[PDB]
Structure 1
Amino acid sequence: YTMSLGAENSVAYSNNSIAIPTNFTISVTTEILPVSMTKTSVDCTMYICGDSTECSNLLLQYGSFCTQLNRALTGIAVEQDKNTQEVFAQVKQIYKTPPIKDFGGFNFSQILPDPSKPSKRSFIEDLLFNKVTKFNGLTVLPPLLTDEMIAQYTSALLAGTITSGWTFGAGAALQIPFAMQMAYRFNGIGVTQNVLYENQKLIANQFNSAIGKIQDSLSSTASALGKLQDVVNQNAQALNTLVKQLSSNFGAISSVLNDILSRLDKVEAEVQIDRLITGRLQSLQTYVTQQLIRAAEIRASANLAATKMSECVLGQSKRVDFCGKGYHLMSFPQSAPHGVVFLHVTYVPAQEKNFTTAPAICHDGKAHFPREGVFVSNGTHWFVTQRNFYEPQIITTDNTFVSGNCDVVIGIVNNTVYDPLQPELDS
């Protein structure tokens, strides 16, 4: 079939119509990023020759072609701890949560650490660890940070975020109640903070239910980890290609180098072994070039994950579609094998009403404009309201500022503007 690009939508535009959302949905859009890859290391002489002095005395004729591969793979291997360090170690203290979890109704129990485990991962980090899954001179080195140290850094970032908001990104963590942190975060997206307090149980239930759906996604759908399982697969496919190229002949009588040396005298054997050295060195240079280009692709992803950590976790982002989808509230980091996972909390506006609107209002000749928000009418009365949540208010000299007169403005409308100082005198 010809692919659909999406459902078609004529937006209901006209020069005096505005749609304002009367309600919202808090959403948790997961995002998954590679951060590191398997720290392979190779003895280029044990791969190419392997326990033959008769071959090593030929491989020395190629000079630094061997030792610069060890140099290049060491460059990648030491860098994977730099990538892991810059992504997770963005906090100089290990913060820990209080004994009582009085977070205003929000239920972090599925993302905070679980004491029931030998490595103290959180519940959602255990789902993420489940979904991701030699004698030939090749070796695999351990990461500097163990998965238990990674899980302490994600707990420090998360216990910081929950107890202190963005403030631990600047100085030492300043405690603030979580019901007041979300009211800062609502002002950050231009939603008046009383829209949190007057809906706090609803906002808590929507966050808690969205955290519920993350566990169902990650339990049911192994392809959620697709970007991390891809990096684990490529670094295994490249090692198996490199190991298979030991069995290739390259034009020698055999690929088993001991079955050259047991069969052939040194006059003949030096012709055959140099075909295997030429072939295996070209195979190792191919692997190291693939790994250098592939490591630069993971480094770009680690620098992106470190930027997501700095701006989405340690702060709140104005950058559209950077931290999730919707207007950004906050993000929680979770570790995964060779990567990081961000649970981006976002305000998505949800239930529109259509209103008649105007750019300005005439009172007695003066044109009044809104300080915060827009003018709207239900069809009979004019109100002013904030851009991102329908909350209609009487149009007043407190909500509005004057400039000029009626003549200048295309589409101005007539209404009274109320001035509270008048009945304050006249009562």
Structure 2
Amino acid sequence: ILPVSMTKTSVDCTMYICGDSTECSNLLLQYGSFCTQLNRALTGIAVEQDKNTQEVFAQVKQIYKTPPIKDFGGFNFSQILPDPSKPSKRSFIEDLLFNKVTLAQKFNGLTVLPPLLTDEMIAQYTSALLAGTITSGWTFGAGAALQIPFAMQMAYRFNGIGVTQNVLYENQKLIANQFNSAIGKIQDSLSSTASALGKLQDVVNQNAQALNTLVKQLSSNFGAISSVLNDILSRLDPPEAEVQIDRLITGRLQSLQTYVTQQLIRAAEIRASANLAATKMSECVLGQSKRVDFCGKGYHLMSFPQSAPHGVVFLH
């Protein structure tokens, strides 16, 4: 499990610092162009977040689909293939992953934007990739998909890892049963244990903590009489009221600076993780890899992608 994108956030500058105060806005205008750099940085972060998913998942020219008859040489893929009965075309393991993640409410000038691709589109992308992998092998990563019986594809992989194909062809039932048992075991492990998805929960927790701290920073006196612009305006003589307001403006501006810097660093880290995920999807899934310990411990055979909230999950 590894993350691919973070929350699509954006914070207004003027409303945050000087919410409903003409005098505060007039004072803020004296500071130059500090109300646009943050907006530009957050816009760049948002575009980067969209591009991460767009490049990790959208790697198929077409949208393949599995034939109605599931005759795959004894293998059983019903636990990872899409389920038409569910309102959303998501697999059993995708549903398990979705139900294992829990948790815009603030309205002080902060907004969240929806992702460009809905979860249905991500599910369709993973379904197309998985159907192509099952039916055509790795030939669909180079040109057009070429059909091939699954047993022959497994023989090709066994030859790829330096084991003669007669080993597979004379033991087919054993490998089929072992693969089915492994799929059942991983489904049970996901259903039972709850601490496996920390790498996806910690990002959400960090973002929530950052936003909560940014909001809670509003209630700091910063050296003034009060933390309310209206209270200071409605009590003090303006020539010193503006002097008092200057401290609040400076404090809130620097808090916004700190939050934006932290967001930039976290976005860079998430981008690095997304690039790694894209490389893994290109290599382990669309082909067979000879890189040791890249696509799981042991000699690699193949992989299956599964979607997750703000992340992707592989089954090497």
Task: Work out whether the TM-score is over 0.5.
Answer: yes
| Offset from partner CA, 1:347-385 (integer Å, 9 cap, x none) | xxxxxxxxxxxxxxxxxxxxxxxxxxxxxxxxxxxxxxx
In the other structure, the counterpart of 2:117 is 145
State the shift of 1:139 in Å.
Answer: 0.9
Q: Secondary structure at the match of 1:223?
A: coil
State the shift of 1:44 in Å.
Answer: 0.9
Q: Secondary structure at the match of 1:334?
A: strand
Q: Secondary structure at the match of 2:296?
A: coil
Preserved CA contact (<8 Å) 1:42 1:137: yes
Preserved CA contact (<8 Å) 1:217 1:224: no
In the other structure, the counterpart of 2:143 is 171
- Partners of 2:242 and 2:40 lie apart in 1 by 28
Q: Select which of 256, 260, 263 maps to 2:228.
A: 256
Comparing both structures, which one devotes a greater share of its residues to helix?
A: 2
Q: Secondary structure at the match of 1:132?
A: coil
| Offset from partner CA, 1:256-309 (integer Å, 9 cap, x none) | 222222222321221121111111111111111001000000000000000010
Q: Secondary structure at the match of 1:340?
A: strand
Which range moves more in the overlay, 207-216 or 293-302? 207-216
State the shift of 1:221 in Å.
Answer: 1.3
- Structure possessing the higher radius of gyration over alpha carbons: 1
| Offset from partner CA, 1:9-30 (integer Å, 9 cap, x none) | xxxxxxxxxxxxxxxxxxxxxx
| Offset from partner CA, 1:377-426 (integer Å, 9 cap, x none) | xxxxxxxxxxxxxxxxxxxxxxxxxxxxxxxxxxxxxxxxxxxxxxxxxx
- Partners of 2:281 and 2:213 lie apart in 1 by 35
- Partners of 1:259 and 1:182 lie apart in 2 by 74
| Offset from partner CA, 1:92-141 (integer Å, 9 cap, x none) | 11111111111111111111111122221110000111111221001111
| Offset from partner CA, 1:206-254 (integer Å, 9 cap, x none) | 1111111111111111111110011111111111111111111211212
Which range moves more in the overlay, 255-264 or 156-165? 255-264
TM superposition score normalised by structure 2: 0.97
Preserved CA contact (<8 Å) 1:106 1:208: yes
Greater relative CO (CA pairs within 8 A, separation 6+): 2
- Partners of 1:58 and 1:115 lie apart in 2 by 59
In the other structure, the counterpart of 2:164 is 192
- Partners of 2:145 and 2:99 lie apart in 1 by 33
Q: Secondary structure at the match of 2:219?
A: coil
In the other structure, the counterpart of 1:305 is 277
Which range moves more in the overlay, 166-175 or 247-256? 247-256
- Partners of 1:199 and 1:252 lie apart in 2 by 80
State the shift of 1:43 in Å.
Answer: 0.6
**Identity within the alignment, %:** 99
1:237-256 pair list within 5 angstroms:
237-256=209-228
Query: Does 1:51 find its partner at 2:20?
Result: yes
- Partners of 1:261 and 1:199 lie apart in 2 by 84
Q: Secondary structure at the match of 2:64?
A: strand
- Partners of 1:74 and 1:159 lie apart in 2 by 36
**Cα RMSD (Å) of the superposition?**
0.9
| Offset from partner CA, 1:148-167 (integer Å, 9 cap, x none) | 10000000110110111111
- Partners of 1:207 and 1:253 lie apart in 2 by 69
- Partners of 2:217 and 2:204 lie apart in 1 by 21
| Offset from partner CA, 1:142-193 (integer Å, 9 cap, x none) | 1101111000000011011011111111011111111111111111111111
Q: Secondary structure at the match of 1:148?
A: helix
Query: Does 1:154 find its partner at 2:123?
Result: no
Preserved CA contact (<8 Å) 1:34 1:227: yes
Q: Secondary structure at the match of 1:196?
A: helix
TM superposition score normalised by structure 1: 0.72
Q: Which runs of 5+ in 1 are unaligned?
A: 1-31, 344-427
Structure 1 segments of 4+ aligned residues over 6 angstroms from their partners: none
Q: Secondary structure at the match of 1:224?
A: coil
In the other structure, the counterpart of 2:5 is 36
Preserved CA contact (<8 Å) 1:89 1:153: yes
- Partners of 1:45 and 1:73 lie apart in 2 by 15
State the shift of 1:88 in Å.
Answer: 0.4
- Partners of 1:94 and 1:64 lie apart in 2 by 47
| Offset from partner CA, 1:32-79 (integer Å, 9 cap, x none) | 010000011011111111121111111111222111101001111111
State the shift of 1:196 in Å.
Answer: 1.1
In the other structure, the counterpart of 1:21 is none
Preserved CA contact (<8 Å) 1:247 1:255: yes
State the shift of 1:325 in Å.
Answer: 1.0
Comparing both structures, which one devotes a greater share of its residues to strand?
A: 1
Q: Secondary structure at the match of 1:322?
A: coil
Cα distance change of structure 1 residues 63 and 119 upon mapping to structure 2, 3 Å threshold: farther
- Partners of 1:43 and 1:94 lie apart in 2 by 40
- Partners of 2:184 and 2:230 lie apart in 1 by 60
Q: Secondary structure at the match of 2:196?
A: helix
State the shift of 1:342 in Å.
Answer: 0.3
- Partners of 2:288 and 2:210 lie apart in 1 by 39
State the shift of 1:319 in Å.
Answer: 0.6
- Partners of 1:44 and 1:321 lie apart in 2 by 47
Aligned residues: 312
Q: Which runs of 5+ in 2 are unaligned?
A: none
Preserved CA contact (<8 Å) 1:163 1:178: yes
Q: Secondary structure at the match of 1:341?
A: strand
